[PDB]
Fold this protein.
Amino acid sequence: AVPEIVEVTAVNSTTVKVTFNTQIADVDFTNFAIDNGLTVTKATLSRDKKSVEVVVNKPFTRNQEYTITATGIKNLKGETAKELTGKFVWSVQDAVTVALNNSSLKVGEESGLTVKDQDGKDVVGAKVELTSSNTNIVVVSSGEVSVSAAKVTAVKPGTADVTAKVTLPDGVVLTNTFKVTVTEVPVQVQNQGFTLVDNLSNAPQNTVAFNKAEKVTSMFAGETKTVAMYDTKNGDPETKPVDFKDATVRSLNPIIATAAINGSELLVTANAGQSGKASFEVTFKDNTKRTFTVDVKKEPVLQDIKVDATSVKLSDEAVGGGEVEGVNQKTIKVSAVDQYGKEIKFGTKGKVTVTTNTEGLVIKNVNSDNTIDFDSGNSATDQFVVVATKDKIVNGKVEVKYFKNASDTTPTSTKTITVNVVNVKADATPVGLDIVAPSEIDVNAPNTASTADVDFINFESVEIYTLDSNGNRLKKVTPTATTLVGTNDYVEVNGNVLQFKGNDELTLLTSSSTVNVDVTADGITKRIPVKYINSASVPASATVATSPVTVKLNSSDNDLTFEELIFGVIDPTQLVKDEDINEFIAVSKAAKNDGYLYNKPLVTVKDASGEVIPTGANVYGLNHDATNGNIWFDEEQAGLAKKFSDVHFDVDFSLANVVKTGSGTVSSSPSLSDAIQLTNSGDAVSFTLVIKSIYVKGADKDDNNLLAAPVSVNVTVTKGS
Amino acid sequence: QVQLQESGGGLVQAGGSLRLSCAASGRTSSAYAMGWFRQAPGKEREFVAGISSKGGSTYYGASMKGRFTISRDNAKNTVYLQMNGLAPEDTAVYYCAASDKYNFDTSHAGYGYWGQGTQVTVSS
Ligand SMILES: [Ca+2]
Ligand SMILES: [Ca+2]
Ligand SMILES: [Ca+2]
Ligand SMILES: [Ca+2]
């Protein structure tokens, strides 16, 4: 078995690993050489005697082919080979990406992982070990599993890091950490036709707004709240909250809470230190009666603590020394919570201690009696730090104990944090990175209630750590370069920032994909994947009703534009108007024609998830003076921090089979704004619409077309006598 | 989609007391506000009383509360109309109705699902 060169990999910009056929004899710099002006500085055989780390005097140029030459290499224990020649490049040519499919979950949801090669295909036989920083919040598959089997499961609302250590079939290990956020699936409150409010001024404008919003039928003991209640009449939503003038109210559980009518307003008062269901009976002038029930809750009171981690993995030291957050120490947050799990100032009644029985762990930022005082009881939060001791490689745990009364000998509860200290060398060679970037950017982030999603990533802001060959952390570093791989129609990199291009992606993006970003830090480049989405409900597809349309104009009227024909003529006689905001909020239930004067609209539009977007007469907040239905959202776009470019459509269409009767007229080639003109009764125009594109107004008729195939529609327009 | 089945109709003498029941079948049928209507002979259909999905709220037609009381058993997903102190003008087909929404609506148009009715007849 005679020394041959099997692999040559640029492990960083000044270091190259050369792997051989067999075990070899002890070697130094004199044994190796490198072309293109570089000189070899050092050469160190591993303990596996199977490879040699060779460091070069000066960084490799990206994408330059170099040739290593090995002279005088001895085998196992005998013979010396002739000159060996090995080429290599320093670039991330055949990188493998590791991606968490979905990093914002609701409770109950799950997410898989995706591992792909340079050609974008799944890596067969790839394995992964996941681990969660906080298993109260996120839980993961145990042990080592196939990548396609791996699962991250959402358990409780909040936050967790999930380390993914992936083993490729050829034995390479890639390690990265993901940021996972779990949000609550909000509890469905029994709908009682009211909601509890500070004052009537900040209440929903009408019955439709009320049914759309979150309802509050709870209050704390010691409060009073005003009742905002909403009726419909003949199925039609009312236009203002119910008025309690001349009504009388009876309190059915007056020990718990009481009610009083003061002019138009009904005010419920919850009594101190009471709780449970309290009901009321209202009697109106008209001899109708109704009841309703409010949940009174105990006042909030300190109940328990919460810690922001369940396990921590630390390196025994940091390269360069010191105590470095993320490498050889970890800061842990502790929060004080009430009986409903909300933050509450810590008292001075109780105490919390932080302790370990594990030699080699050090607790800092803690009082000498092991307590943490929560800014002497004024704060709902506090913190401590755990630190590894150099070269003491022990795994143990930290206990965080809450005592109801400071003087109690037994704790009321105990939270446990497991801690694993791994050994790293003070002079370890860095060979990879852990870049803790968020998994996903969403162009709609600024409009989502969640404050956790982002519409960009600044890579100068993300924790990045260098790793040794074992996958353990060495040092905190910052990026030297960031660059997009390939091109993409929706996103780009500018400096160190991944972001949306700005060409109206909010209104126009209806797909989702993943982009790759090469990030260089400390002479190492890593390819990291990022998904982009758009959770806005914007038009993605449209459909045209096919059946012939006949419009009979009133003897009073002459004209119908194409925009009116296609999208409809609004008829306010069929709609409900909120006078307070001068907008329509509904189609009456008695409506003879879905809210439209002539024919019903021809176009039905959907969003990316397949849901119908309300259009025309169904747009909540449609202005009082709207004349046609070419609209898919509120003109003023109430509620949005970031607006759509345009809430209307444009259409590409042609006109065929024109037949005019009497004085009827119409253009040979109209736009949306041109009109069918009929002067006398008996005048008519007949024709066929060929609709070719439908798209958001101002966008592109080809690229943003919502219509899969063109469609033809026969139309007749006559005038009544 | 929901289905409603009434029970407990029949003959009763003036001054007496009867209970009607209506059981709701479906998938998220638990989530349905329900109500009672009636059509007496010679008269137009009229609203009697209504209840929220979990019985926290009820409402009544003018002058109907007393003579009538609505309640609900959530476990059985059934709703009950209790009639006390009946008189000949309560002779009627009593219908159960259900709705997607709860907003104190006392008209037919506030309700999208109907049972088929039961007859209640009141002697002298
Ligand atoms: Ca209003
Ligand atoms: Ca060490
Ligand atoms: Ca947001
Ligand atoms: Ca508007």
About this structure: Residues 54 and 74 of chain B are 6 Å apart (CA to CA). Chain B has one domain: 1-124.
